[PDB]
Amino acid sequence: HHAIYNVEVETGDREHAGTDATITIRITGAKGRTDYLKLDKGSFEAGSKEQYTVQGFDVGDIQLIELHSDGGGYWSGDPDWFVNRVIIISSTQDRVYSFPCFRWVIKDMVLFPGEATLPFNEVPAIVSEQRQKELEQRKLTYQWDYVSDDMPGNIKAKTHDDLPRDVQFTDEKSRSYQESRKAALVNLGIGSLFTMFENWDSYDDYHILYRNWILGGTPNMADRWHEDRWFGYQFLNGANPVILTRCDALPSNFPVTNEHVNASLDRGKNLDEEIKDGHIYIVDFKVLVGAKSYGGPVLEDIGYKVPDEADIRYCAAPLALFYVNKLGHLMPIAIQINQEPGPENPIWTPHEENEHDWMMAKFWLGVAESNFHQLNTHLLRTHLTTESFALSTWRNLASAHPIFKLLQPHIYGVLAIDTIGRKELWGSGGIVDQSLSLGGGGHVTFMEKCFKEVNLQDYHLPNALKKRGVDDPSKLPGFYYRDDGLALWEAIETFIGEIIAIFYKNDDDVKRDNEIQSWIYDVHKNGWRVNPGHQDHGVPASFESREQLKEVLTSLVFTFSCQHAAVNFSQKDHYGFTPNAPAILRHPPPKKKGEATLQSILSTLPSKSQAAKAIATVYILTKFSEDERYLGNYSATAWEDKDALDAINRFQDKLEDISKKIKQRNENLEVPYIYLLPERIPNGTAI
Ligand SMILES: [Ca+2]
Ligand SMILES: [Ca+2]
Ligand SMILES: [Ca+2]
Ligand SMILES: [Cl-]
Ligand SMILES: [Cl-]
Ligand SMILES: [Fe+2]
Numbered sequence: 001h002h003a004i005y006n007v008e009v010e011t012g013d014r015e016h017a018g019t020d021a022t023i024t025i026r027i028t029g030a031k032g033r034t035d036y037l038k039l040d041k042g043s044f045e046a047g048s049k050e051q052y053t054v055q056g057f058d059v060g061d062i063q064l065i066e067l068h069s070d071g072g073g074y075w076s077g078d079p080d081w082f083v084n085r086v087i088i089i090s091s092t093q094d095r096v097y098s099f100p101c102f103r104w105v106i107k108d109m110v111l112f113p114g115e116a117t118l119p120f121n122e123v124p125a126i127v128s129e130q131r132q133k134e135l136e137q138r139k140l141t142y143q144w145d146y147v148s149d150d151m152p153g154n155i156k157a158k159t160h161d162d163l164p165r166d167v168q169f170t171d172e173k174s175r176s177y178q179e180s181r182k183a184a185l186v187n188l189g190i191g192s193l194f195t196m197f198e199n200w201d202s203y204d205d206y207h208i209l210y211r212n213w214i215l216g217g218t219p220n221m222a223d224r225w226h227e228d229r230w231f232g233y234q235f236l237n238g239a240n241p242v243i244l245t246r247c248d249a250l251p252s253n254f255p256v257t258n259e260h261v262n263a264s265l266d267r268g269k270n271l272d273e274e275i276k277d278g279h280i281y282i283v284d285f286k287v288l289v290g291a292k293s294y295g296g297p298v299l300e301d302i303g304y305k306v307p308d309e310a311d312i313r314y315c316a317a318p319l320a321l322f323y324v325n326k327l328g329h330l331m332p333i334a335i336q337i338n339q340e341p342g343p344e345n346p347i348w349t350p351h352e353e354n355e356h357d358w359m360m361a362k363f364w365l366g367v368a369e370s371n372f373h374q375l376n377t378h379l380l381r382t383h384l385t386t387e388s389f390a391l392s393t394w395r396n397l398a399s400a401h402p403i404f405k406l407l408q409p410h411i412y413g414v415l416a417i418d419t420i421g422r423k424e425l426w427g428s429g430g431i432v433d434q435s436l437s438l439g440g441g442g443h444v445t446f447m448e449k450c451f452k453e454v455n456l457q458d459y460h461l462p463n464a465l466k467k468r469g470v471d472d473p474s475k476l477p478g479f480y481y482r483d484d485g486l487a488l489w490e491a492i493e494t495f496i497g498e499i500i501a502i503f504y505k506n507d508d509d510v511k512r513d514n515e516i517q518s519w520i521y522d523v524h525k526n527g528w529r530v531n532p533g534h535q536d537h538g539v540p541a542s543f544e545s546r547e548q549l550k551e552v553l554t555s556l557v558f559t560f561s562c563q564h565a566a567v568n569f570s571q572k573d574h575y576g577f578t579p580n581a582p583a584i585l586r587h588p589p590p591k592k593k594g595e596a597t598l599q600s601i602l603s604t605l606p607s608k609s610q611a612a613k614a615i616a617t618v619y620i621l622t623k624f625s626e627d628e629r630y631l632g633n634y635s636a637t638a639w640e641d642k643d644a645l646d647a648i649n650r651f652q653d654k655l656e657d658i659s660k661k662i663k664q665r666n667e668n669l670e671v672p673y674i675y676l677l678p679e680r681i682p683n684g685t686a687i
Contacts, residue, residue: 019081029059150448219576240373246469292442370583388527413686456538480673
């Protein structure tokens, strides 16, 4: 004759989560559906758990609910309502129904009870219809847009506030970001006054520049940047640990011989023998040829052609050779500043007659490294490329889908920061233009050039390390990015495998899942588009197995969290003392040996205000928000399935073990490697 429904609603704790809109709820089940019933006694504050008792038609077994908000009245400041979950008990049913949400309620929100499902799993027809309608609507809200033909697809949004609220920064992240921008302007202005009439005449002058910033500690390379051992160390454990490969033969255009490097070898063998023993490594920045730097110079194979106080910046495409010495230290042993060898682009070594020439060579290798790292390793290959997958998750996976639930905490952030970044950070005029040689426009062309070579197999850490020849700790010791990254790769892969096995019982279940198929196909066709001049991007058009699904999800999750953390949060230590890693140089490279002086070097190195702006950029890009959730913290995820909860438990406990092992390893290091501690790795790419 009627049922009594006990309704409990948990509102999210985040700022503005609450609402004063009038809320109603309609309940549907096997027997029919109630009317919209008022939940209108008391307030919905952030963090609240509020209870209601409403009476209506007995729907029998409950199958879905619909919340409605009237959107507030004249005085409502922020009617949008963030709902974590609704729990209902019906007087006629011996069951507790739990409806996870974790999304913003704007006007209407449909929710289903119980565990995640694949689209073909058996559910009431009205559930399947609502699921199909959700996804129709996703496609109108979440649309592809592109910087150019040669960039990965991004979310269509003019500014951050045009984004769907589910993918905007939380108010806490927007405050953390806007406050960081204000603090940077204040610290720049105070440091500008303090240093205004400073005679800039030594490398140690640059130490002033980080002193009035809250960076979490003096840059850990400030005291040792000038030592070859610590210069070499950072190609393993600094901000850009992705380019060094094992050298099994010198490139024909980098004609280093035993006579150039023998004074550096110290295990009793010559250069050819050390190459065969796997102790010789190399970096090749050839991708930077053709790069257009601010003020006009265009990099050639030979460097630059024989050209008041204009802002003119330079870069380089060097090769550099390194050697693992008998103590296990990676030492820099040769640098050629540009690609085409000869007298005007010679090989520089730590044994230069003129010590300033070797220091200048190391600075040219750093400028190439900085521009490559910021634009390719960090901006393109974390943010801009994984942004396509975040967009495709919203377009193609229903909120009921288990892989939607898995990805939510990891995709969060990237749409918001990238929408902001296109306007304020690496877009035209942004803080990047003030701080990189390739700023001014050349930085977009350069990312385009890099994106043409991008392949999804690059995001597979064990395969990429093996491919680079850097995975054998007996030949290449002291490589903590590799050690910690591989431990976390395995932990994430194990977890994802266990989630997949709960919902997909065999390969057929993958092939039949039209949403996961649409998801990968959307990236394949519209996300990482193989356009004229592009290599294949390694994105499959479909999934055929559980293992293939695991491998793509692991790559993606590991990149959003760990890889971004390793190449982003390492920036204070890498760049905070400018001479450790200059990102702008002001004169072209030398065309003969014996020229460099401390003074010609200081005039090539960034100006005080260029260096200050680099520090400011790093400060902004590396600020953790006070609401950040770190790796494995799934406190705001929508899981209900008991087995999924247990898989999460095992994963968190694994992460906890990896954390203690990293801290134990660190206690014996001269310079602890902390960027891959789980407690410092955000779930996502949000800054
Ligand atoms: Ca609100
Ligand atoms: Ca109440
Ligand atoms: Ca738990
Ligand atoms: Cl009713
Ligand atoms: Cl679930
Ligand atoms: Fe970032």
